[PDB]
Design a protein around this ligand. Structure first.
Ligand SMILES: CC(C)C[C@H](N)C(=O)NS(=O)(=O)OC[C@H]1O[C@@H](n2cnc3cc(CO)cc(N)c32)[C@H](O)[C@@H]1O
Ligand SMILES: [Mg+2]
Ligand SMILES: [Zn+2]
Length: 843
């Protein structure tokens, strides 16, 4: 055994040993209990990020722990390959998105393999291969026939200088990001998933997920946004009916979740697209400009509450059906056309947004709720203003004294006898738009024929193959410019027809890949029936918090879609969910002659302050933040592997912080990981250099010295701690410190005797197995030096309960070192000032 720890000498061999034994290439063996542990698969962006290593190390710890516990573990990996980065790279470097993708995949695959993750590479998938995406085209055609996929016109942002569509996140002050040109709103036909049909299913089934962070569950409940409210109709005043037609001349209909405050409405608000706004703006140019500015906006709902709320009065009035009050109609920028009736009522006293709106415009506020004897102040908001639980109505005529629900029912009854309203359930959730005006994505399997209409491609003809021999130019997506692709024959009548040129939202690939891993070479369906029945659902899912809403909701949606098609049998794809934090690093800069800052990478800086590694000209040390190209602070994990080995990388990510926490890049941290691995190596080496391996101590520990009993107590205590940390708590830094404490106590125990060496063998054989999930290369190597059996078949260390039993310490008795003085005095009496450990005072 070499004296010094050298990871490049040991990590290739251990990997070859694991590969040769095929421990991670798993089948559907019904003679072993399955465990499906899955990490969110990456975009083939080019190379691994430190965030990738953190995520996949965590997955590997959990996977190796379950394997060591005798599970049939599947840990699959693959490539979320479609999307914009390949297209941007194609436009910048004059290469095909497919070519750039496959090169990144094969490079990143080598990096993953070098880190020694226990991965079933036989189950690899790449979503940009037709053998993969044909199956989402297939599901598409079936849902299209059932109407779950449908086609309606939608509005998009059109950049006329870049000649493509832009999401709202790419519009700043009404202009495109990479162009600066004013975008135009356009209505184009697009395809949608009728996800709103599954809204109550997707909401209620969240309650089943006892092993998900309640933060994630709560963010999904808020996103679906179900409310039980009330449709209320306010009749248009006779002096306000000019220019209106139909039901819009008779009443303004709104939806509200607080009908118990209808008596407190002091104005109503309407969206810019509403016929009342249209009729009021007919001869008022200030309203026209407000309506245009509202339509010009492109505000994503991640920022539509940050938006300053503005409004304009219309001079039109409506009548409150419960008190007959006349209420002015306002056009407001926060009322969105397409949500409910595109019109709301406002109760400034009991809705904080209404309060602030009424405060800006000096609109009236009428208190109709009271909570205890709390004081109501019309000029400062208070949290209790909005309480529904502990409140009673006031200033509400015959409704006074009622609580929330009884008032709700009383208002529904009053409105329904009058025909002025009725209860209604609403959801914030919108249908899922999937059309993308991009090339590098899965083709939509629809053909347009002027005789037959929008026709799905027959299953016999799937896939619609995306041509890989394309280089995006930047003057529109290429598929619309490629008659060789879109000119085709109608599969229904045989005549001239054109393929859909839009591609699918790339979230679609990642909404079902976890099922595809179960049978990735299955040619007859999305997933084999045999394999879906065996593997069931994912037991453990691990990925970043940035996917808590969209991806997980889509994933749960597709699972219920696939279940309803008869392809799978589970209601929910993900049993346990672990969300990993960010990775941050310090940033560096030198100032600009043009009054700015230029951001230097950490690898090109050396800290004494700090100065460059090139010019030696000092750089300024700045703030710590998420590793990214913005402030050029990403640390390449490849150079960390090059400089220290994979086990160091893995250990450092697991020790620095718990998974949910942000992991700070730390050079002193990495050096500490390496040194502990060096200490682990030397400990085993020094142990063998004195006597060589012996049979590990087992059995009755009577006759062992107090010192060696104490070490066995620490050992099996550490084993139980680590197991509870891997299985339950999923905090891996605490497990590492526990093993470090075990080694500390070993270091201070004389283990030189014969029973001493037997206990030392027991200690070391357990520690290497307890650390194998975090650092399997060095543990595999040291284990072979200690014991000739196969580590993965020796299995997870067992706790020895006997080793936790502590000893036996006008009349004396005997009591355990775990008893207490309540029975120490009950055993002595067979005021008693008990002497814990020497006597007892019978007064
Ligand atoms: C299932 C689908 C939707 C996954 C998708 N292909 C994806 O996000 N693909 S991805 O390639 O972007 O990331 C794959 C996984 O690794 C994590 N990750 C990667 N780079 C990271 C950098 C930092 C910086 O602090 C932090 C984290 N957490 C990072 C990321 O959260 C995700 O769980
Ligand atoms: Mg359950
Ligand atoms: Zn036809």
């Amino acid at each position: 055994m070499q004296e010094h720890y050298q990871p490049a000498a040991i990590e290739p061999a251990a990997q070859k040993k694991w590969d040769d034994a095929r421990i991670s290439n798993v089948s559907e063996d019904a003679s072993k209990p399955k465990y499906y542990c899955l990490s969110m698969f990456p975009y083939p962006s080019g190379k691994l990020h430190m965030g990738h290593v953190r995520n996949y190390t965590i997955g590997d710890v959990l996977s190796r722990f379950k394997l060591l516990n005798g599970f049939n573990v599947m840990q699959p990996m693959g490539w979320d390959a479609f999307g914009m980065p390949a297209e941007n790279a194609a436009m910048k470097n004059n290469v095909a998105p497919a070519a750039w993708t496959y090169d990144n995949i094969e490079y990143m695959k080598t990096q993953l393999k070098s880190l020694g993750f226990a991965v079933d590479w036989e189950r690899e998938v790449a979503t940009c291969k037709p053998e993969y995406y044909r199956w989402e085209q297939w599901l598409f055609t079936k849902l299209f026939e059932k109407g779950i996929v449908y086609r309606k016109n939608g509005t998009v942002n059109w950049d006329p200088v870049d000649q493509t569509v832009l999401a709202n996140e790419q519009v700043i002050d009404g202009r495109g990001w990479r162009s600066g040109a004013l975008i135009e709103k356009r209505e184009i036909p697009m395809y949608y998933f009728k996800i709103t049909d599954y809204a109550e299913e997707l909401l209620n089934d969240l309650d089943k997920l006892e092993h998900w962070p309640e933060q994630v569950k709560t963010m999904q409940r808020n996103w679906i946004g179900k409310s039980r409210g009330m449709t209320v109709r306010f009749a248009v005043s006779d002096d306000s009916k000019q220019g209106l037609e139909g039901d819009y001349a008779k009443f303004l209909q709104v939806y509200t979740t607080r009908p118990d405050t209808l008596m407190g409405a002091t104005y109503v608000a309407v969206a810019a697209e509403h016929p009342l706004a249209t009729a009021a703006a007919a001869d008022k140019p200030e309203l026209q400009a407000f309506i245009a500015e509202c339509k010009a906006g492109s505000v994503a709902e991640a920022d539509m509450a940050t938006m300053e709320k503005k409004g304009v009065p219309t001079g039109r009035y409506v009548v409150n059906p419960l008190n007959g009050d006349k209420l002015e109609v306002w056009i407001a920028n926060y009322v969105l056309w397409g949500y409910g009736d595109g019109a709301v009522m406002a109760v400034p006293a009991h809705d904080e947004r209404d309060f602030e709106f009424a405060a800006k415009y000096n609109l009236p506020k009428k208190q109709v709720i009271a909570v205890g004897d709390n004081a109501f102040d019309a000029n400062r908001w208070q949290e209790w203003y909005g309480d529904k639980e502990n409140g009673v109505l006031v200033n509400s005529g015959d409704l006074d004294g009622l609580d929330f629900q009884t008032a709700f029912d009383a208002v529904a009854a009053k409105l329904q006898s009058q025909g002025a309203g009725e209860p209604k359930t609403q959801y914030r959730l919108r249908d899922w738009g999937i059309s993308r005006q991009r090339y590098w994505g899965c083709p939509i399997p629809i053909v347009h024929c002027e005789k037959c209409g929008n026709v799905p491609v027959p299953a016999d003809q799937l896939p619609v193959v995306l041509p890989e021999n394309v280089v995006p130019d930047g003057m529109g997506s290429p598929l619309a410019k490629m008659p060789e692709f879109y000119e085709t024959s109608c599969p229904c009548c045989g005549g001239a027809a054109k393929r859909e040129t839009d591609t699918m939202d790339t979230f679609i690939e990642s909404s079902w890949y976890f099922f595809r891993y179960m049978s990735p070479k299955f040619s007859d369906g999305m997933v084999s029936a045999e394999s879906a029945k065996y593997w069931g659902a994912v037991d453990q899912y691990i990925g970043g918090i940035e996917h808590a809403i969209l991806h997980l909701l889509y994933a749960r949606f597709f699972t219920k879609l696939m279940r309803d098609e008869g392809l799978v049998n589970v209601d929910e794809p993900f049993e346990r969910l672990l969300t990993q934090g960010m990775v941050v690093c310090e940033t560096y800069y030198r100032e600009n002659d043009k009054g700015g800052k230029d951001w230097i990478n950490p690898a090109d800086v050396e800290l004494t302050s700090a100065v460059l590694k090139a010019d030696g000209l000092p750089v300024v040390i700045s703030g710590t933040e998420k590793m990214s190209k913005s402030k050029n602070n990403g640390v390449d994990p490849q150079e960390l592997i090059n400089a220290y080995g994979a086990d160091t990388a893995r250990l450092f990510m697991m020790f620095a912080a718990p998974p949910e926490q942000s992991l700070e890049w730390s050079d002193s941290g990495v050096e500490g990981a390496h040194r502990f691995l060096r200490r682990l190596w030397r400990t085993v080496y020094e142990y063998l250099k004195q006597g060589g391996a012996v049979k590990a101590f087992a059995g009755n520990q009577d006759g062992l010295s107090k010192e060696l009993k104490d070490l066995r107590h620490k050992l099996h205590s550490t084993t139980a701690k680590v197991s509870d940390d891997y299985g339950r708590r999923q905090q891996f830094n605490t497990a590492i410190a526990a093993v470090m404490e075990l080694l500390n106590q070993y270091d201070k125990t004389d283990t030189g005797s014969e029973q001493g060496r037997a206990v030392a063998q027991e200690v070391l054989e357990a520690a290497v197995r307890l650390l194998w999930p975090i650092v399997p290369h060095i543990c595999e190597t040291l284990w072979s030096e200690l014991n000739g059996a196969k580590l993965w078949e020796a299995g997870w260390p067992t706790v020895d309960e006997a080793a936790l039993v502590k000893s036996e310490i006008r009349g004396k008795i005997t009591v355990a070192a775990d008893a207490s003085k309540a029975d120490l005095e009950a055993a002595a009496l067979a005021k008693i000032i008990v002497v814990p450990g020497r006597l007892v005072n019978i007064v």
